[PDB]
Amino acid sequence: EKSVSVILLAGMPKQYIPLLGQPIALYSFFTFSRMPEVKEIVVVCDPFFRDIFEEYEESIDVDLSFAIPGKERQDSVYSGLQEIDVNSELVCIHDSARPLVNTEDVEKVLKDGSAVGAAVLGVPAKATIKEVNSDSLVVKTLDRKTLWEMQTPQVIKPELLKKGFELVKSEGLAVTDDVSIVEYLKHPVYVSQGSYTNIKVTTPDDLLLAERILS
């Protein structure tokens, strides 16, 4: 209990558009707040939108903190990381554009993060996805490989994430997707099987789909 620090990434933005009267960002916010494992939520957002979360501070059973967003997603993660409780055993990074994450799936990725050191929610990729080289040719592999689409939460022990940022900074390495920093480390990353309902709200068509799932 109260071992986990959540970093909620929320930096006309899509994550503040209402679903059934509630801004998208508040759905995951409340899901995390109800979990006894969660001690605190560090919301990374433009100071303009702080009131959206601040309104519920005494109602929720977590500490609320804020951090300023950065230029890219990993900079926002780093900013949030500076505000967590010094004794938190686990950091739980979530895209606020994913409002429909199930408590049960958060529980799973928290467990796996604790066990392995780093874990992320994923689902099997349904489409035919292939590696393509610089001459636009399919890179053929009869060595079979199952591909998974990553979601959030991404759950990691704070010291491991900090070492990841330190390595990328010191050596000046390229950050290209949402698990690139840990990919440079030798520490394993577990993929916790999530739900296809945990969609990211990018456009008004997702905005619509999110609302159906809520029904």
Next chain:
Amino acid sequence: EKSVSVILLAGMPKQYIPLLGQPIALYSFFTFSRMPEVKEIVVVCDPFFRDIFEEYEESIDVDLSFAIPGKERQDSVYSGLQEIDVNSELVCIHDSARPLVNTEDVEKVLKDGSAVGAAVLGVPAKATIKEVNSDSLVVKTLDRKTLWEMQTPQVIKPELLKKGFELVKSEGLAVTDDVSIVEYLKHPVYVSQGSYTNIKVTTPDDLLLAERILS
């Protein structure tokens, strides 16, 4: 001109639900029919739905043929393959659940199919997608690889596709995704860059999205 045979895969089914009053399957059907390169369309469908396509035979400037569907998608491809003109230089396989394919993108993949021998429409995968091993761990690769989501058409020289089917049959090989048969061959497969609008209609949420794009 008239060098291409289209195999249109259409076997309460999703591909016969109307978009703006026209069954989904007819959209790609008509797109192909207007192209001078296309000589014929072999529709693979349950005999029950033949009338949907048969209604327009004298109106369209292509030959119309039919083939019975098989158990899996590759069996339907094989059935359609048996009906093409004996002198067709190119077979153009299309999922009828993709009604929004642009003529310009069909032209591109036809060109690339002719040049390379095998080509497929694709777009860069937007999500973070990773290989995951049997212990549910991310298979790390600092050797960077750009992943692409495959669409249709899949365009191939008939003799190459036939050799692919012959190899899979003779050796009893596993067909696991929509490009597995050519993956066993040494012949290259080109990925022609398509459009994100060329979506597959799997559910009523796609059914809705397809209709927006049409507006």
